[PDB]
Design a protein around this ligand. Structure first.
Ligand SMILES: Nc1ncnc2c1ncn2[C@@H]1O[C@H](COP(=O)(O)OP(=O)(O)NP(=O)(O)O)[C@@H](O)[C@H]1O
Ligand SMILES: [Cl-]
Ligand SMILES: [Cl-]
Ligand SMILES: [Mg+2]
Ligand SMILES: [Mg+2]
Length: 370
């Protein structure tokens, strides 16, 4: 059937309706609603947040022609913990391992302040000896063990995000931390060599590092697009709103590559007076803040104890639309750099990476467990 994801963002709630193909996802509809009901990745006003989510499901329904009733929810990398764990289940007869057995051994891991939301297999072990990655259709005489990666989140976040969404008359079939979702926007080589995803949104910037095909660790920083706007507003002595517009229209994150011929007029906040500015002027502010964010990212990587980023950097999210971000980052790092943008029609904006990869995740577990 169809897969419906919901990304409850600080700038906009995003919903994608997709269909699973052998080698991909066919997107058949989207919904997007900007709201002030979400701040810093979390619900700021329940009622307003409910309205936006409800409205977005509506938009997604009308656009896809589907009667959305069940959805997969992405969860931000806040109050999150990643760790290892293993579990084993016993058989009392020769058993050909299928999806149900895998679901059961992982389930046990998903057995106080937090709640396990994702449990993915690193490797499986049949009858205390044969170690394999895919144990399907093979025979076990005694057992099936799993060495899994585990993501858990603070109960308060989970409980409130689900309640808010289910208050719009829909069922949350499953939850997917963005820590696991990003695994899907990376190529096999990136996930192997050791790659870092950086999603710069509005209030939150998220970081997730994958290595040897698996998620190693992740975290989030409270510095992103809004902060870029704030500096612009302060610098050009103009309102937040106007600063937001010039950021989209003339924004550039690399001063040297920023243009001078590009000019625009901005009204002042303290006087009827108006002032002229060049893109290079605007870029002074944008580069400074984006640079800071990246330095914040490097600090996260060190605390996480992750020097060495062999697979390169993948930058995505709404602020990734900013010109000069690739230049800026590669100008301060030796490893490869790229901006990820979903390829499907209608969601070809970096802000859609979370929503679309949430579907990739639902599909992955669909194929794993079925
Ligand atoms: N063309 C653009 N140029 C520069 N910035 C942009 C552009 N388009 C969107 N943005 C910024 O992208 C941010 C929102 O992107 P988004 O990835 O959707 O964040 P979010 O997911 O809604 N909220 P969150 O992830 O919780 O921080 C806002 O700060 C926008 O100003
Ligand atoms: Cl075990
Ligand atoms: Cl994806
Ligand atoms: Mg986001
Ligand atoms: Mg907001």
């Amino acid at each position: 059937h169809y897969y419906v994801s919901i990304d409850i963002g600080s700038s906009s709630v995003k919903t994608i309706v997709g269909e699973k193909f052998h080698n991909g996802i066919n997107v058949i509809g989207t919904g997007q609603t900007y709201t002030s009901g979400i701040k810093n990745g979390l619900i700021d006003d329940f009622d307003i947040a409910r309205q936006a989510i409800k409205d977005t499901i509506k938009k997604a329904s009308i656009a896809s022609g589907v009667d959305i009733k069940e959805v997969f929810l992405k969860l931000p990398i806040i109050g999150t913990e990643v760790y290892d764990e293993s579990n084993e289940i016993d058989f009392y007869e020769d058993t050909e391992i299928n999806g149900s057995h895998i679901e059961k051994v992982l389930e046990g891991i998903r057995e106080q302040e937090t709640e396990v939301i994702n449990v993915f297999p690193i490797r499986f072990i049949v009858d205390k000896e044969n170690e394999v990655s895919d144990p399907k259709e093979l025979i076990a005489r005694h057992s099936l063990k799993v060495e899994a990666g585990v993501i858990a989140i603070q109960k308060s976040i989970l409980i409130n995000m689900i309640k808010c969404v289910e208050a719009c008359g829909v069922d949350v079939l499953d939850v997917y931390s963005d820590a696991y979702n990003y695994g899907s926007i990376l190529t096999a080589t990136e996930k192997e060599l050791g790659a870092c995803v950086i999603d710069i949104g509005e209030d939150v910037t998220q970081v997730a590092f994958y290595e040897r095909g698996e998620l190693v660790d992740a975290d989030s920083i409270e510095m992103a697009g809004r902060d870029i706007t704030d500096d612009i507003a302060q610098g050009l002595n103009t309102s937040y709103e106007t600063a937001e517009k010039v950021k989209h229209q003339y924004g550039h994150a690399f001063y040297d590559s920023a243009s001078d011929q590009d000019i625009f007029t901005v009204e002042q906040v303290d006087s009827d007076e108006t002032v002229q500015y060049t893109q290079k002027d605007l870029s002074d502010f944008i580069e400074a803040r984006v640079e800071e964010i990246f330095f914040e990212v490097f600090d996260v990587l060190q605390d996480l104890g992750l020097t060495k980023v062999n697979g390169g950097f993948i930058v995505t999210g709404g602020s990734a639309n900013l010109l000069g971000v690739k230049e800026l980052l590669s100008d301060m790092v030796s490893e490869k750099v790229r901006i990820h943008t979903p390829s499907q029609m209608g969601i070809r904006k970096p802000e859609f990476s979370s929503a679309i990869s949430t579907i990739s995740s639902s599909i992955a577990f669909d194929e794993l467990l079925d």
